[PDB]
Design a protein around this nucleic acid. Structure first.
Lengths: 61, 44, 67, 88, 99
RNA sequence: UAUGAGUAGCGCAAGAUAAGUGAGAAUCUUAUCCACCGUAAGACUAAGGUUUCCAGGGGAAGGCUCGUCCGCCCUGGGUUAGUCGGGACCUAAGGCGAGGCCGAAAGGCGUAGUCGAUGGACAACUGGUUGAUAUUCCAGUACUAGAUAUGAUCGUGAUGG
RNA sequence: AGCAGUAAGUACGCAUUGAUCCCUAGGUCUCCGAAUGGGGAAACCCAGCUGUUACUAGCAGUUAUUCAUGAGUGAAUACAUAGCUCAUGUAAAGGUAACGCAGAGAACUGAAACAUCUAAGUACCUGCAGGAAGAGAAAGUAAAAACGAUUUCGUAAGUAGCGGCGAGCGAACGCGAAGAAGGGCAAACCAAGAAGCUUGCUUCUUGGGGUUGUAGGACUGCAACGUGGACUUAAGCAUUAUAGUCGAAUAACCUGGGAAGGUUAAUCAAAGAGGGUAAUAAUCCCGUAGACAAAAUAGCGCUUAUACCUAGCAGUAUCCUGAGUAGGGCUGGACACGCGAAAUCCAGUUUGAAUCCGGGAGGACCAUCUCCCAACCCUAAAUACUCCUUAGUGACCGAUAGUGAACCAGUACCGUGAGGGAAAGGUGAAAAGAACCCCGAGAGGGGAGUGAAAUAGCACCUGAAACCGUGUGCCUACAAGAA
C-alpha cells in the first residue's frame, strides 16, 4: 500500500470471450522508494505514476 | 458407550470464558446479539 | 416530631470531619455493640440501626464531602 | 475501622469459649492479619491467629423462587490466654 | 378525599343514609372502614389474641362514592376545598362550610 | 380423553425370625443367625458432582410398589494450614503478542516480552479430638523464612561468566 | 395524613410542628466491564510509587496503550539521526434502535432447461457519520429566445431506449407542487520578514488581493449597504418542558345483596370525553372544559451595539484561473447503455497537452452556432427512519388472540456452544377464606355458621365435549346387520 498515490488494490471484474461474468483484483504499481530528505529519511511505498511525477512537485509533496 | 462431554473446569471454560468469547471481535459480536436479546445470562 | 429535631439539629454547621464528626465519624462510628447487639438479640429496639447509620451517612456525605 | 460483622453462636461456640476461641464474621474484602489487628484494637484481646475458612453461598429455594442466600467468611478467632474474653 | 374525619353519610349501597365517625380512612384503600357501617363479622379461631375467636365485629370498607362527608350541621355534597384561608379550607356545597 | 389394559414390565444378587416403632410395617430401627463380595462388591484419591454431609422435624409430590425411612421436604449446623495442592517461583507443548511484516477492511503472522502444569524447584509429624473438621483444633517435637531487639567488619559477591 | 415498596409480616417505630411521597440539583458511588499498574477463565490474584497513618498494616490517590505536543537523551559514527526517557492533551479507543454513505460482495431464482441477462450490486460482512446523512452552486440542460445550484413528490411513462432484442430491465427533457442562500481559497499580484542570504536571492512565513464567463481579478480609475449572507458572540425580553394547583352542576320512591337501572322531580353549562363506584351516573368520586403554578430545570424564539468580511464602476501593461491535468492506447465499471456508431463520467496501467487569441459540452466524428469555465473547498432548508420521551388514535385484538412473552419471558427447559424455546389471567362486592362440633393417622369430608348465593371454598365466574358413571320405562341369552 502507498499513501500519496491515492487508492489501493481495488476490486474489479473480469470479462472473457462471450463474457463469462468473472472477477479481477486491481493492483497499482508497488515500489518501496526513499527519494528525498527534507527532514524525511522515510522509506515508504510508491506507484510508478507518482514516480514519473516525482518531478511534478513531489520532493516535499 | 462413551459419551461426548465429560468435561473438567478448564474444559467448560477456555472456549466460552468472557475473554475467549470477547477476544476475536466476532464472538463478542454474537455476545452482543446475546445482549440485545438479553437472555438468562451472558457468558455461558 | 422526634426525627426532624433529632436529625436536623446535628451538624449543618461547618465544623469538620476529624473536628466535628468526632461524635459520628469517630465515636458512634463504633457501630459495635448496637450492631453486635444485632443478631445477639436482647435489643428489642430497631430503628437505631438505619437511624444511626443514616446520621453517620449524612455526616459523611455532607460534612465529610464538603471539603 | 470496626468492620467486624457479627459473632456466630453454634454448639461449637461454647467449645470456642472454653478454648478461648471465637467465631466472628467480617466482610469478604479482608485479611486475617488486618482483622487480627482490628480485633486487637477494638477488643484488646490477645490473638494467636485466625483460621482461613469461608462459606459458599446457599442457593436453595426460599419462597416461591430460589433463595439465593449468600456466603460469609467464618472467622475462627484463635486467641492466646491472659486477655479479655467477651461473653456476648 | 382529604382526611376523614367526621360523621359520614352513606347514600347508596347496603345501608342507606347511615352516618358514622371516621379518622382511619387510609385513602390508598380507596374505600373507608367506618364504625357502624358495613358490619363484617369474622369467625376467627380460638388462637392468639382471642382464645375464643368466632366473632370479630370489624367492619368492611365501602367506596368513596358511598362515603359522603357532611359539614357539621349534617350537610353533605361536593367538597369545595382550599378556597378560603392560609393553606386550605374544606367545605361542601349548600353547606354550613365547616371543614 | 380413550384404546390395548389391569396385560407387559416392576431395571442382572437371598435373607431370616423375634422384639421395638407407630396409626399404620415386609420393605423403618435394633438384636440374633444366615448369606455375598473380598486384585473388591474394601480405603484413598483425581476429574467430576456442586452441599447432595450431619442433627432435628415432617411425609404434598419423588423413591418404579408400600413406607414412620431416605441423596425427598422444612429447619439448623457442619469444611479451620508458615509446612497439605495451587498462586505471590520458573518453564515446555501452546497462546497472546508492543515493536515490525504483509494484507479491501476485519485481519493473519511474528522479535522482545507475557502468561500458560500434566513438569522442575521446597519446611511437620506423631497422638488425641466431634454429629461432622483434621498433617489444618490441641499435647509433644520441629524445621523453613522474615522481623525487630544485637560483639560484623571492609563484605556482598550479578540478568554477565 | 398517615408512612413503614412488592404483600401478606413482623416489629421498633416514625409523622399535618410537616412526614411518607413527587420533582430538581448535588453527594457517594462494591467489583467486573472500552476496563487500562501487571498478570489473569467476569464477578480474581499480585504490585510499584506519592503522602497518610501505623504496621512485618491500613487509608487515599498515581502507574495500560496509541496519537499529538513539547522537553531531555544521543548508537553504529563527529554533529545528527534512529532509538530511549519524562511531561502535557479522554484525544480515543468502547456500548450503540433505525435511517445514511463508502468499500467488499454472492447465491437461490426466473428466463419453462441453461452458458448471455435477471435476481441485485440485493442477502451478508467491514468501516465511516449525523440528526438526518449524502446533496449541491452549470467546465449544466436544451435547441429555440431556453433556462438558470441542489433536494423530494407528481408528471412525462414503461415514454425514449437497451437487451441469448428472449425473459426482462429501464430513462432523461420539459412541466406542476414543496422547498426555495450560496460563500470562501489557492492562483496572479502587493507589502513585510528569512533566505539559494551563491550578492540582484526567487524558496519559505505573515497579512492584504480576489475567486471569475461573456471573460474576471491583479495595474490605472473607485463605493461602506448587518450579514446563518458583510460577525448563526454576549445582555435583557418573552414563553415551553420540568413538581402540579383550583375547578361547576341532585333529591326522593320501586326493585333487589346492593341503584347510576325503572319512577318522580330539580340543577348545571369553557365540564353530558373517559374511567371507577357491589347493577348502565352529567349532577358520587377521579376527572373532564377552562383558569392558574415552579425557584432549577433543559430549552425555543424576539431587541440591542458588538461577536467581521463582502459590493458597483470604465479601461486593459502583462500575469493568473486549479498538469501527469484534459486527452490518447489497453483493460474494466457505471451511466437505460449487455463494446456497440457508441456518447459522457470514474477506476488501474501507459503516454501526454494547451492554457484567455484559451479550453470544454452539444450521444462516433468534421465545420457553424448555443451554453459553460472543470481538473481547489465548504453549503441550511425541504428528505429517510425510530430503540427512545409523552400527548394520544383505533369499523386493532381479546388470553391458541394480541409481543416468543397480559402471568417475575427470553422464564422453565433442550443443547458444550453458537442457538432454540415453552405452558399458564379471572372466587367473592368485600376474604367477609368456612369460628366451633363430629368423623377421620393426617388430609379430606360432614354438620354448623359465612356470604345475595358454598354446585361459591382458594388452579374459585360460566360450564359443553370426548371418558367414566349411578339410577331409571322397554327389549334382548336359536342370534351370523355399514348396525
Amino acid at each position: 500500500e502507498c499513501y500519496f498515490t491515492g487508492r489501493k488494490t481495488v476490486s474489479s471484474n473480469n470479462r472473457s470471450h462471450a463474457m463469462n461474468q468473472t472477477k479481477r483484483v486491481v493492483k497499482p504499481n508497488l515500489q518501496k522508494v526513499t527519494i528525498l530528505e527534507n527532514g524525511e529519511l522515510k522509506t515508504v511505498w510508491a506507484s510508478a505514476k507518482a514516480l514519473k511525477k516525482l518531478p511534478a512537485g513531489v520532493e516535499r509533496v | 458407550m462413551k459419551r461426548t462431554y465429560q468435561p473438567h473446569k478448564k474444559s467448560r471454560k477456555t472456549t466460552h470464558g468472557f475473554r475467549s468469547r470477547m477476544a476475536t471481535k466476532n464472538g463478542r459480536r454474537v455476545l452482543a446479539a446475546r445482549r440485545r436479546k438479553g437472555r438468562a445470562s451472558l457468558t455461558v | 416530631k422526634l426525627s426532624e429535631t433529632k436529625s436536623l439539629l446535628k451538624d449543618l454547621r461547618a465544623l469538620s470531619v476529624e473536628e466535628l464528626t468526632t461524635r459520628e465519624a469517630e465515636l458512634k462510628k463504633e457501630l459495635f455493640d448496637l450492631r453486635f447487639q444485632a443478631a445477639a438479640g436482647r435489643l428489642e429496639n430497631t430503628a437505631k440501626l438505619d437511624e444511626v447509620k443514616k446520621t453517620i451517612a449524612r455526616v459523611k456525605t455532607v460534612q465529610a464531602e464538603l471539603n | 475501622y470496626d468492620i467486624i460483622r457479627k459473632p456466630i453462636i453454634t454448639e461449637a461456640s461454647m467449645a470456642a469459649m472454653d478454648q478461648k476461641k471465637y467465631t466472628f464474621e467480617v466482610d469478604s474484602r479482608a485479611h486475617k492479619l488486618l482483622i487480627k489487628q482490628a480485633v486487637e484494637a477494638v477488643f484488646d484481646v490477645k490473638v494467636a491467629s485466625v483460621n482461613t475458612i469461608s462459606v459458599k453461598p446457599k442457593s436453595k429455594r426460599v419462597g416461591k423462587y430460589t433463595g439465593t442466600k449468600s456466603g460469609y467468611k467464618k472467622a475462627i478467632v484463635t486467641l492466646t490466654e491472659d486477655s479479655k474474653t467477651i461473653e456476648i | 378525599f382529604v382526611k376523614t374525619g367526621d360523621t359520614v353519610k352513606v347514600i347508596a349501597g347496603k345501608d342507606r343514609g347511615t352516618t358514622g365517625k371516621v379518622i382511619k380512612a387510609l385513602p390508598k384503600v380507596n374505600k373507608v372502614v367506618v364504625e357502624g357501617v358495613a358490619i363484617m363479622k369474622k369467625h376467627q379461631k380460638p388462637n392468639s389474641e382471642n382464645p375464643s375467636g368466632a366473632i370479630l365485629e370489624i367492619e368492611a370498607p365501602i367506596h368513596v362514592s358511598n362515603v359522603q362527608v357532611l359539614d357539621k350541621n349534617g350537610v353533605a355534597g361536593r367538597v369545595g376545598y382550599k378556597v378560603v384561608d392560609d393553606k386550605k379550607v374544606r367545605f361542601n356545597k349548600k353547606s354550613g362550610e365547616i371543614l
